[PDB]
Amino acid sequence: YIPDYKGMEPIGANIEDLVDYSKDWLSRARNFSFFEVKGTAVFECFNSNEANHCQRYPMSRKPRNFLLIQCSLITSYKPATTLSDQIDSRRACSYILNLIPDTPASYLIHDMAYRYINLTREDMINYYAPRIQFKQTQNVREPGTFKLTSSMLRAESKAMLDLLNNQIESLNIASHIVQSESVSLITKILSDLELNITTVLDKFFQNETQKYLIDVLKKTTAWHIGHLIRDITESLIAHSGLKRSKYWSLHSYNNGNVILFILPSKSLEVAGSFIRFITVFRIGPGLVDKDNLDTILIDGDSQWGVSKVMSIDLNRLLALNIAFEKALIATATWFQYYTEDQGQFPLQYAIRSVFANHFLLAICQKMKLCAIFDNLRYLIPAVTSLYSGFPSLIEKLFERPFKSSLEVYIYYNIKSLLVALAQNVYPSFMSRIVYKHYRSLISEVTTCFFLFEKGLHGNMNEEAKIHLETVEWALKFREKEEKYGESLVENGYMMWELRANAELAEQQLYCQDAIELAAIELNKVLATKSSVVANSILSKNWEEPYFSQTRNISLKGMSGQVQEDGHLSSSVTIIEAIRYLSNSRHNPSLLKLYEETREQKAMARIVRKYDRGFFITTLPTRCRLEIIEDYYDAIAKNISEEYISYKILAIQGALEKALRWASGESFIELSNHKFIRMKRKLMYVSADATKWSPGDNSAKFRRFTSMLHNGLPNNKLKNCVIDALKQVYKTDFFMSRKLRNYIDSLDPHIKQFLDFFPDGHHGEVKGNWLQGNLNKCSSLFGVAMSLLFKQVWTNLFPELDCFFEFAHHSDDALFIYGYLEPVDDGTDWFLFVSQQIQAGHLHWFSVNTEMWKSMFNLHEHILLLGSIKISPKKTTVSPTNAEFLSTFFEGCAVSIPFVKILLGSLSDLPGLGYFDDLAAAQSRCVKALDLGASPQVAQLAVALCTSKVERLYGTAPGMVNHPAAYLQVKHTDTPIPLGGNGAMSIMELATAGIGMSDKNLLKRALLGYSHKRQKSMLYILGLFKFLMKLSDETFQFIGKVQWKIFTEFEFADMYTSKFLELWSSQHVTYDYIIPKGRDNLLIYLVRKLNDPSIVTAMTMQSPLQLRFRMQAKQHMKVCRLDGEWVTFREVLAAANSFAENYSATSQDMDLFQTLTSCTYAWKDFLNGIHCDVIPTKQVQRAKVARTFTQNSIPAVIGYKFAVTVEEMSDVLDTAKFPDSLSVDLKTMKDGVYRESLPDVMKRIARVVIVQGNVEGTAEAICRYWLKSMSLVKTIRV
């Protein structure tokens, strides 16, 4: 049912009025929005911005520090163990004691070393024993700590502690001396870091990756420095616990050459806590910043550098712990990109220098460098294009002050690189190589950008920036509304109003005539496809229940109810769905929910920490946005073949028309019949016209929806969409408590931001839909207005044969303007222009020279007739350029660079247990391999991730939790949940999946017991049976050891757990499909809250409650066994005992046989495929996305266990064809019988970026992956 919803009345809009206005507009001189690049222009822009920056910020003489941990290495480094730690600590304390301190930091250092050296044997035994053997003593209260009362502490040392317990300036960038000093320092550091210290996939890896990358980087100083920093950060993390952060600690590494002194600090579990330490090292080559060192104590024929008290937060610590892996993966990505670019391996010096630069970037995680690289990502294309917004970007480069010497060196390198690029083979950024294609340079800068953790973003400065941006645009909207009236701003102005004012053409101010004409131009195309438009609109299923869909019960994040304190509650979508279902009496449809929540105001907030991009909104706002998005996505999919890319063929189709039109030549007629030969040229603009802008007006869409012609017979749905757009007009923006407290704890901008809120917890914002999902609506509007500009231009110059073709993919948009230039370069064209301008065609003044400039000016103005503004910065216009088109097509093709997923895998883990996070790490590297990563790079990433996971859980050989110590089976043949080699290969993981090791093992084990009846095969079967027993004990693959999960929600305990288990057992069908009714959907959603895999996702960013909460237990009692919390060693021993006495049974054999039978012959293909190399140079092709692959599978399974009328009706409703369901079962069971009982059925139960040659078959994808195994040499399968 659709209610009457007023609707809108059509107005009389004539294209001739717009054409006349365009004539009047073009009759005068207009300025261009972009500046020509010349090299000199970029250099003067840099100089002027340098002078302005020097004037703006106060000048400082002493640069700040940038090395969080300073250390030096002369010899090779071996990982630190307990006995090595003992010997190192003793030697280091002796070395410190023989010295003479100078400053309070040195006095504290000497005092702590002297206190450590005088500990008794009992304390030393307890200082290094694990928790099991640990005993509290007088001087040692926690495993790796000791106390320090005031008595041993000196007066000065205490001074440091009291100073610890108890304006903005920048460097002189314009000065040549500061730049020279910073460049010299960073060059010294980098040169020290580069100094040397003194299956078939395996074959290809050892031939290429292990030889030219890992063998080269194995001997460098940066490799061992990264390992040393990993050890130091591991020791710091071990000290960040709740019970250990209160006391001091001392550690040593590298034969007594590096020492770490940990001071008392607030535990990192509570947010905003900094672990404080002092690092003391013998001064030598490496991460040494002598100026920023606290002291340099003198020793005979030696120097000992003592750093200042370094405070490192949580995310910085976690980033430093994985800095070496991030640097290695970035270097591997650069290695792959170099091989792609040039076809030859990088030499020694190039690889060493790029690895040193990546390591230095990964060590120093600073906001300034992250912003600098983010800006450079767009600065590079803007400098290679004929015209662009480069000054706006160069001005953005100086937003923040330059504090450390690292920022000055990076800025100097960027300035040199940009000036070299604009003068124009493209120079590199951290080496002496010139790339053949600048896409390699863009990828290099992108890899550098992704080396910075996505936790740096946010802070309290970024949230303030986005808040002030929103408030500034809201205040601008209020000013415009009071200046022109409420009605004119909301409903838009008319053509004659704009003609009279000649100013209303601005942002947050649209023209009704423009909207109507754009809708008419869209309807021109839309009329021929009315039937399919109506079918697609009706196919959105507006009648199905709202909360039974997956998008409405996800973890997206929505605003809750307003509280008594007046602040909006951030919460989860599923929680709000549960709340509504509990308060409601049914499960309403989309339109019914909109009817119920039409009167409620739209409230909005900002996500706490997950943050500028997510304006979380309440349920009614989401419902209205979903109505509008469903309608506009339904009507917009039909013209996706030509204008709205979702796709590549549309962009290819537009370019083909442009090139063909340019190939043909044109003649213009004359009154004297003297045809004039015109040369056709093309100009390409890469504009981000359709991004969401804070300054905008949603109300325009109303009129658009009023005139957009669908095939529906009634106007009920159109009026409903218009009413939803009307209700999403006004919103109640809410202050975040963090920002409120930060501001409460004087600036005029802050003052005016405060007056924007009457009550200090909320203020009204109008016309800004606050980043809500209206992407399809915005893209459709942009396409319609581009078509309107095309029509206006064709009406403006009928005699001229100009060309305009546009494509809109996501936020980016490509405009191609085909213009006419004189061939003879004579005055005949200007003579004709003069004749036309004298004949009354005054608008021909702007066509005299540079027709494409006037074309773009008119296009930008026509877009401005709405709220669309082509961003001055970030738009780049170039002639017909193969590289430009190639990078545009690549950015349209490679949606996400694989290096983002690669670095992300080491940065975050689920922490649900060894198997779970190992699977997640292996899955992320597989997804990156899908995204375009070379198999060798993905194999390297897999190795690094698996090694990190093994280090975390002590599974690697020669560690406490090694399965081979007790399980009497080889580490390779051990099941994955108990520690299992868990390495395999990237090909096996990508093709088969992320669990094949267990089945292959089980399968062979079954065979090993079926034919030879060997004892070890029976042992493996016993281990598998033990895992199945543990899984049976655990409540909702073969079997998983349960690991402790640390917690918490409003409705998470609405029903008892035993009732949930009983309901899940009784209503089996709801496990496979979602229950439509409210009384059962409520219980299903409550069950979804208690799922362990979801709680870890809601709190995955919790400050330590997840990040180090379980990186602390590691070797404690965290596993579940026999209803007890026990150590992993105890679980391994229990598994060994169970498997030793396990006796084979017929039922277990049947279960194992069924599981093996259930688990495409992907492994068999990889064994049977043959690959032989050919001596032929590799060729790089365009990147293209492919897919790797009657009733739905769950519906038939859901139908199988249907026992009541409600369940059977629900499985009808969710199924596409509810009639065929029985037939499916009727055959499916027979198939099972040829391969029934409930339990057997219960246990029975990808976009890939490739080259253009690859087909859409999964075998073709696997063959391509096999071909891409060699970075230089081609392969034949």
mmCIF file of C-alpha atoms in Angstrom, residues 200-488:
data_model
loop_
_atom_site.group_PDB
_atom_site.id
_atom_site.type_symbol
_atom_site.label_atom_id
_atom_site.label_comp_id
_atom_site.label_asym_id
_atom_site.label_seq_id
_atom_site.Cartn_x
_atom_site.Cartn_y
_atom_site.Cartn_z
ATOM 1 C CA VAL A 200 57.076 -24.831 -8.859
ATOM 2 C CA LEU A 201 56.169 -21.717 -6.854
ATOM 3 C CA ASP A 202 59.013 -22.574 -4.474
ATOM 4 C CA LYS A 203 61.403 -22.816 -7.433
ATOM 5 C CA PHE A 204 60.331 -19.436 -8.812
ATOM 6 C CA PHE A 205 60.456 -17.820 -5.360
ATOM 7 C CA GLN A 206 63.976 -19.112 -4.705
ATOM 8 C CA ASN A 207 65.055 -18.031 -8.191
ATOM 9 C CA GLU A 208 63.656 -14.486 -8.104
ATOM 10 C CA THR A 209 62.279 -13.236 -4.778
ATOM 11 C CA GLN A 210 64.662 -14.993 -2.385
ATOM 12 C CA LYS A 211 67.691 -14.044 -4.503
ATOM 13 C CA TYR A 212 67.151 -10.448 -5.631
ATOM 14 C CA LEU A 213 65.120 -9.210 -2.635
ATOM 15 C CA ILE A 214 65.568 -11.280 0.532
ATOM 16 C CA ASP A 215 69.199 -12.267 -0.042
ATOM 17 C CA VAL A 216 70.027 -8.615 -0.742
ATOM 18 C CA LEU A 217 68.120 -7.275 2.275
ATOM 19 C CA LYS A 218 69.253 -10.049 4.635
ATOM 20 C CA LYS A 219 72.700 -8.531 5.241
ATOM 21 C CA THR A 220 71.610 -4.898 5.603
ATOM 22 C CA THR A 221 71.640 -2.983 8.871
ATOM 23 C CA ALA A 222 67.932 -2.173 8.510
ATOM 24 C CA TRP A 223 66.990 -5.870 8.694
ATOM 25 C CA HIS A 224 68.698 -6.427 12.045
ATOM 26 C CA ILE A 225 67.598 -3.011 13.330
ATOM 27 C CA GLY A 226 64.014 -4.002 12.559
ATOM 28 C CA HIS A 227 64.453 -7.285 14.411
ATOM 29 C CA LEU A 228 65.968 -5.428 17.381
ATOM 30 C CA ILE A 229 63.091 -2.934 17.431
ATOM 31 C CA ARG A 230 60.675 -5.872 17.279
ATOM 32 C CA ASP A 231 62.334 -7.326 20.384
ATOM 33 C CA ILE A 232 62.274 -3.967 22.192
ATOM 34 C CA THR A 233 58.603 -3.397 21.367
ATOM 35 C CA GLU A 234 57.738 -6.942 22.458
ATOM 36 C CA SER A 235 59.392 -6.262 25.815
ATOM 37 C CA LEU A 236 57.522 -2.951 26.085
ATOM 38 C CA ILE A 237 54.190 -4.634 25.299
ATOM 39 C CA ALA A 238 54.893 -7.285 27.935
ATOM 40 C CA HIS A 239 55.341 -4.408 30.402
ATOM 41 C CA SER A 240 52.100 -2.662 29.370
ATOM 42 C CA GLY A 241 49.946 -4.971 31.497
ATOM 43 C CA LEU A 242 47.693 -3.798 34.297
ATOM 44 C CA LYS A 243 49.769 -5.450 37.030
ATOM 45 C CA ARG A 244 53.191 -4.673 35.518
ATOM 46 C CA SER A 245 52.959 -1.035 34.389
ATOM 47 C CA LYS A 246 53.211 0.155 38.005
ATOM 48 C CA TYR A 247 56.811 -1.023 38.455
ATOM 49 C CA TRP A 248 60.131 -0.347 36.738
ATOM 50 C CA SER A 249 61.946 -2.792 34.456
ATOM 51 C CA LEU A 250 65.315 -3.316 32.781
ATOM 52 C CA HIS A 251 66.148 -5.277 29.625
ATOM 53 C CA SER A 252 69.142 -5.584 27.313
ATOM 54 C CA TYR A 253 69.930 -6.894 23.795
ATOM 55 C CA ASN A 254 72.778 -7.211 21.189
ATOM 56 C CA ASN A 255 75.614 -8.438 23.512
ATOM 57 C CA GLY A 256 74.931 -5.656 26.074
ATOM 58 C CA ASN A 257 75.031 -2.968 23.411
ATOM 59 C CA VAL A 258 71.369 -1.884 23.710
ATOM 60 C CA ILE A 259 69.547 -1.340 27.008
ATOM 61 C CA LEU A 260 65.901 -0.489 27.703
ATOM 62 C CA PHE A 261 64.750 1.059 30.990
ATOM 63 C CA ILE A 262 60.984 1.060 31.536
ATOM 64 C CA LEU A 263 59.622 3.627 34.015
ATOM 65 C CA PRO A 264 56.273 3.325 35.814
ATOM 66 C CA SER A 265 53.357 4.364 33.632
ATOM 67 C CA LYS A 266 49.604 4.117 33.325
ATOM 68 C CA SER A 267 48.643 0.704 31.981
ATOM 69 C CA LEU A 268 47.885 0.702 28.264
ATOM 70 C CA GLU A 269 44.549 -1.051 28.889
ATOM 71 C CA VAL A 270 42.970 2.284 29.799
ATOM 72 C CA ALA A 271 42.837 4.626 26.815
ATOM 73 C CA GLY A 272 45.118 7.647 26.655
ATOM 74 C CA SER A 273 47.954 5.868 28.473
ATOM 75 C CA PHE A 274 51.610 6.222 27.484
ATOM 76 C CA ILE A 275 54.330 3.731 28.383
ATOM 77 C CA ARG A 276 57.477 5.668 29.275
ATOM 78 C CA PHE A 277 61.008 4.384 28.732
ATOM 79 C CA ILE A 278 64.638 5.366 28.184
ATOM 80 C CA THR A 279 66.842 3.608 25.624
ATOM 81 C CA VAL A 280 70.631 3.569 26.063
ATOM 82 C CA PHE A 281 72.898 2.431 23.254
ATOM 83 C CA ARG A 282 76.533 2.468 22.226
ATOM 84 C CA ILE A 283 76.775 5.179 19.560
ATOM 85 C CA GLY A 284 77.400 3.691 16.128
ATOM 86 C CA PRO A 285 75.732 3.367 12.742
ATOM 87 C CA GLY A 286 71.913 3.401 12.581
ATOM 88 C CA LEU A 287 68.766 5.033 13.939
ATOM 89 C CA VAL A 288 70.805 7.705 15.823
ATOM 90 C CA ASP A 289 69.724 11.350 16.108
ATOM 91 C CA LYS A 290 72.607 12.854 18.064
ATOM 92 C CA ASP A 291 71.007 16.285 18.480
ATOM 93 C CA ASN A 292 67.842 14.842 20.036
ATOM 94 C CA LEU A 293 69.775 12.484 22.326
ATOM 95 C CA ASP A 294 69.563 13.450 25.985
ATOM 96 C CA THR A 295 73.256 12.777 26.681
ATOM 97 C CA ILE A 296 76.333 11.198 25.168
ATOM 98 C CA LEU A 297 78.277 9.674 28.052
ATOM 99 C CA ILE A 298 82.001 9.224 27.285
ATOM 100 C CA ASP A 299 83.838 5.866 27.756
ATOM 101 C CA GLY A 300 87.411 4.889 26.828
ATOM 102 C CA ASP A 301 87.451 4.449 23.002
ATOM 103 C CA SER A 302 83.584 4.417 23.080
ATOM 104 C CA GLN A 303 80.442 6.621 23.457
ATOM 105 C CA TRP A 304 77.084 5.754 25.052
ATOM 106 C CA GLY A 305 74.075 7.677 23.765
ATOM 107 C CA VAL A 306 71.210 8.162 26.214
ATOM 108 C CA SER A 307 67.883 9.239 24.749
ATOM 109 C CA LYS A 308 65.203 11.349 26.393
ATOM 110 C CA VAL A 309 62.201 9.845 28.164
ATOM 111 C CA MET A 310 60.150 8.537 25.233
ATOM 112 C CA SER A 311 56.379 8.274 25.660
ATOM 113 C CA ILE A 312 54.794 5.957 23.086
ATOM 114 C CA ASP A 313 51.057 5.332 22.913
ATOM 115 C CA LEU A 314 49.160 2.150 22.092
ATOM 116 C CA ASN A 315 48.761 2.242 18.310
ATOM 117 C CA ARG A 316 52.302 3.558 17.890
ATOM 118 C CA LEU A 317 53.612 0.607 19.916
ATOM 119 C CA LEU A 318 51.630 -1.877 17.830
ATOM 120 C CA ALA A 319 52.868 -0.218 14.627
ATOM 121 C CA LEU A 320 56.487 -0.335 15.806
ATOM 122 C CA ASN A 321 56.188 -4.023 16.713
ATOM 123 C CA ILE A 322 55.388 -4.842 13.067
ATOM 124 C CA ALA A 323 57.537 -2.139 11.444
ATOM 125 C CA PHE A 324 60.014 -4.609 9.935
ATOM 126 C CA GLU A 325 57.253 -6.697 8.345
ATOM 127 C CA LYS A 326 55.543 -3.590 6.959
ATOM 128 C CA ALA A 327 58.824 -2.341 5.493
ATOM 129 C CA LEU A 328 59.566 -5.745 3.956
ATOM 130 C CA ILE A 329 56.094 -6.005 2.411
ATOM 131 C CA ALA A 330 56.306 -2.458 1.042
ATOM 132 C CA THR A 331 59.712 -3.274 -0.449
ATOM 133 C CA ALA A 332 58.301 -6.449 -2.010
ATOM 134 C CA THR A 333 55.434 -4.435 -3.506
ATOM 135 C CA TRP A 334 57.910 -1.909 -4.915
ATOM 136 C CA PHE A 335 59.976 -4.827 -6.245
ATOM 137 C CA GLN A 336 56.944 -6.239 -8.057
ATOM 138 C CA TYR A 337 56.028 -2.815 -9.444
ATOM 139 C CA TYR A 338 59.588 -2.253 -10.682
ATOM 140 C CA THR A 339 59.590 -5.644 -12.406
ATOM 141 C CA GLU A 340 56.234 -4.812 -14.001
ATOM 142 C CA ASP A 341 57.493 -1.402 -15.137
ATOM 143 C CA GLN A 342 60.872 -2.373 -16.588
ATOM 144 C CA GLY A 343 60.980 -6.174 -16.856
ATOM 145 C CA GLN A 344 64.353 -6.404 -15.078
ATOM 146 C CA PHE A 345 65.088 -6.922 -11.400
ATOM 147 C CA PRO A 346 66.185 -3.925 -9.312
ATOM 148 C CA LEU A 347 69.878 -3.826 -8.488
ATOM 149 C CA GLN A 348 71.446 -4.022 -5.038
ATOM 150 C CA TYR A 349 71.629 -0.304 -4.255
ATOM 151 C CA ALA A 350 68.071 0.409 -5.413
ATOM 152 C CA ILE A 351 66.554 -2.359 -3.286
ATOM 153 C CA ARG A 352 68.619 -1.453 -0.227
ATOM 154 C CA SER A 353 67.783 2.262 -0.486
ATOM 155 C CA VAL A 354 64.057 1.687 -1.008
ATOM 156 C CA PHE A 355 63.944 -0.775 1.898
ATOM 157 C CA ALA A 356 65.742 1.729 4.128
ATOM 158 C CA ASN A 357 63.288 4.476 3.161
ATOM 159 C CA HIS A 358 60.275 2.223 3.779
ATOM 160 C CA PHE A 359 61.691 1.167 7.152
ATOM 161 C CA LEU A 360 62.319 4.781 8.169
ATOM 162 C CA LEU A 361 58.767 5.716 7.169
ATOM 163 C CA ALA A 362 57.314 2.766 9.091
ATOM 164 C CA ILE A 363 59.325 3.584 12.228
ATOM 165 C CA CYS A 364 58.261 7.251 12.373
ATOM 166 C CA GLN A 365 54.453 7.173 12.303
ATOM 167 C CA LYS A 366 53.575 10.876 12.322
ATOM 168 C CA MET A 367 50.478 12.764 11.213
ATOM 169 C CA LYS A 368 52.416 15.288 9.121
ATOM 170 C CA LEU A 369 54.029 12.636 6.917
ATOM 171 C CA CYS A 370 50.732 10.781 6.474
ATOM 172 C CA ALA A 371 48.996 13.975 5.354
ATOM 173 C CA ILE A 372 51.960 14.860 3.128
ATOM 174 C CA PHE A 373 51.813 11.532 1.292
ATOM 175 C CA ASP A 374 48.013 11.689 1.067
ATOM 176 C CA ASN A 375 48.315 15.085 -0.628
ATOM 177 C CA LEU A 376 51.189 13.924 -2.852
ATOM 178 C CA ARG A 377 48.995 11.097 -4.169
ATOM 179 C CA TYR A 378 46.905 13.751 -5.940
ATOM 180 C CA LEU A 379 49.740 16.255 -6.402
ATOM 181 C CA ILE A 380 51.605 13.928 -8.775
ATOM 182 C CA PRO A 381 48.844 13.686 -11.445
ATOM 183 C CA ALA A 382 48.053 17.405 -11.115
ATOM 184 C CA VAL A 383 51.633 18.309 -12.098
ATOM 185 C CA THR A 384 51.850 16.042 -15.180
ATOM 186 C CA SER A 385 48.532 17.385 -16.670
ATOM 187 C CA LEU A 386 48.464 20.503 -18.939
ATOM 188 C CA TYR A 387 46.083 22.414 -16.612
ATOM 189 C CA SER A 388 45.096 21.591 -12.996
ATOM 190 C CA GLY A 389 44.533 22.719 -9.371
ATOM 191 C CA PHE A 390 48.194 22.315 -8.292
ATOM 192 C CA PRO A 391 48.418 25.670 -6.309
ATOM 193 C CA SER A 392 45.442 24.576 -4.122
ATOM 194 C CA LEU A 393 47.276 21.294 -3.391
ATOM 195 C CA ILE A 394 50.611 23.021 -2.768
ATOM 196 C CA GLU A 395 48.830 25.356 -0.341
ATOM 197 C CA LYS A 396 47.337 22.281 1.343
ATOM 198 C CA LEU A 397 50.902 20.984 1.688
ATOM 199 C CA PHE A 398 51.597 23.766 4.235
ATOM 200 C CA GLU A 399 48.514 23.365 6.446
ATOM 201 C CA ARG A 400 50.439 21.940 9.411
ATOM 202 C CA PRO A 401 53.743 23.130 10.914
ATOM 203 C CA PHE A 402 57.004 21.355 10.115
ATOM 204 C CA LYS A 403 58.458 20.121 13.410
ATOM 205 C CA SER A 404 60.941 17.274 12.871
ATOM 206 C CA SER A 405 63.858 16.991 10.462
ATOM 207 C CA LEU A 406 62.201 14.009 8.772
ATOM 208 C CA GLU A 407 59.346 16.213 7.556
ATOM 209 C CA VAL A 408 61.781 18.773 6.129
ATOM 210 C CA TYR A 409 63.674 16.109 4.163
ATOM 211 C CA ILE A 410 60.428 14.652 2.811
ATOM 212 C CA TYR A 411 59.202 18.115 1.831
ATOM 213 C CA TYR A 412 62.487 18.917 0.075
ATOM 214 C CA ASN A 413 62.374 15.648 -1.871
ATOM 215 C CA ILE A 414 58.734 16.272 -2.813
ATOM 216 C CA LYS A 415 59.506 19.825 -3.942
ATOM 217 C CA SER A 416 62.391 18.641 -6.118
ATOM 218 C CA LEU A 417 60.354 15.777 -7.595
ATOM 219 C CA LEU A 418 57.335 17.969 -8.363
ATOM 220 C CA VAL A 419 59.438 20.722 -9.946
ATOM 221 C CA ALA A 420 61.189 18.090 -12.068
ATOM 222 C CA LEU A 421 57.858 16.553 -13.108
ATOM 223 C CA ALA A 422 56.325 19.900 -14.071
ATOM 224 C CA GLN A 423 59.338 20.777 -16.232
ATOM 225 C CA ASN A 424 58.401 17.974 -18.647
ATOM 226 C CA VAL A 425 60.290 9.131 -18.086
ATOM 227 C CA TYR A 426 59.394 9.906 -14.467
ATOM 228 C CA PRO A 427 61.958 10.048 -11.632
ATOM 229 C CA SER A 428 61.492 7.857 -8.580
ATOM 230 C CA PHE A 429 61.039 9.058 -5.001
ATOM 231 C CA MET A 430 63.590 7.044 -2.969
ATOM 232 C CA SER A 431 66.138 5.952 -5.579
ATOM 233 C CA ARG A 432 67.908 6.953 -8.793
ATOM 234 C CA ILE A 433 65.525 5.116 -11.144
ATOM 235 C CA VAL A 434 63.360 6.680 -13.847
ATOM 236 C CA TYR A 435 60.146 4.744 -14.393
ATOM 237 C CA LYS A 436 58.725 4.211 -17.861
ATOM 238 C CA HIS A 437 55.123 4.857 -16.753
ATOM 239 C CA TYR A 438 54.086 7.266 -14.005
ATOM 240 C CA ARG A 439 51.535 4.762 -12.691
ATOM 241 C CA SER A 440 54.564 3.176 -11.017
ATOM 242 C CA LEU A 441 55.297 6.498 -9.299
ATOM 243 C CA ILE A 442 51.664 6.769 -8.191
ATOM 244 C CA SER A 443 51.806 3.212 -6.833
ATOM 245 C CA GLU A 444 55.044 4.047 -5.010
ATOM 246 C CA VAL A 445 53.481 7.068 -3.309
ATOM 247 C CA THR A 446 50.381 5.005 -2.496
ATOM 248 C CA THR A 447 52.536 2.315 -0.872
ATOM 249 C CA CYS A 448 54.256 5.031 1.154
ATOM 250 C CA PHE A 449 50.866 6.400 2.210
ATOM 251 C CA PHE A 450 49.644 2.973 3.320
ATOM 252 C CA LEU A 451 52.698 2.517 5.566
ATOM 253 C CA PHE A 452 50.931 4.784 8.087
ATOM 254 C CA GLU A 453 48.387 3.235 10.431
ATOM 255 C CA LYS A 454 44.722 4.056 9.851
ATOM 256 C CA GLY A 455 44.532 4.723 13.616
ATOM 257 C CA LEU A 456 46.511 7.996 13.299
ATOM 258 C CA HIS A 457 43.412 9.496 11.566
ATOM 259 C CA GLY A 458 40.787 10.857 13.989
ATOM 260 C CA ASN A 459 42.909 12.090 16.906
ATOM 261 C CA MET A 460 40.764 14.982 18.327
ATOM 262 C CA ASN A 461 41.961 17.393 15.684
ATOM 263 C CA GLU A 462 40.381 15.550 12.741
ATOM 264 C CA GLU A 463 37.047 15.224 14.552
ATOM 265 C CA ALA A 464 37.147 18.942 15.346
ATOM 266 C CA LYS A 465 37.987 19.711 11.715
ATOM 267 C CA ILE A 466 34.989 17.780 10.395
ATOM 268 C CA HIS A 467 32.715 19.277 13.071
ATOM 269 C CA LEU A 468 33.735 22.843 12.198
ATOM 270 C CA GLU A 469 33.356 22.056 8.489
ATOM 271 C CA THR A 470 29.781 20.856 9.020
ATOM 272 C CA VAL A 471 28.937 23.842 11.228
ATOM 273 C CA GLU A 472 30.497 26.305 8.774
ATOM 274 C CA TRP A 473 28.443 24.937 5.891
ATOM 275 C CA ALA A 474 25.280 24.938 8.025
ATOM 276 C CA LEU A 475 25.906 28.580 8.955
ATOM 277 C CA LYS A 476 26.447 29.437 5.285
ATOM 278 C CA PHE A 477 23.121 27.757 4.517
ATOM 279 C CA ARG A 478 21.411 29.781 7.254
ATOM 280 C CA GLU A 479 22.945 33.004 5.924
ATOM 281 C CA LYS A 480 21.738 32.252 2.391
ATOM 282 C CA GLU A 481 18.291 31.319 3.721
ATOM 283 C CA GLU A 482 17.951 34.597 5.616
ATOM 284 C CA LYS A 483 19.325 36.523 2.625
ATOM 285 C CA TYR A 484 16.923 35.106 0.015
ATOM 286 C CA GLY A 485 14.073 33.712 2.111
ATOM 287 C CA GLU A 486 13.249 30.207 3.266
ATOM 288 C CA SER A 487 11.095 29.370 0.241
ATOM 289 C CA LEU A 488 13.605 30.436 -2.417
#
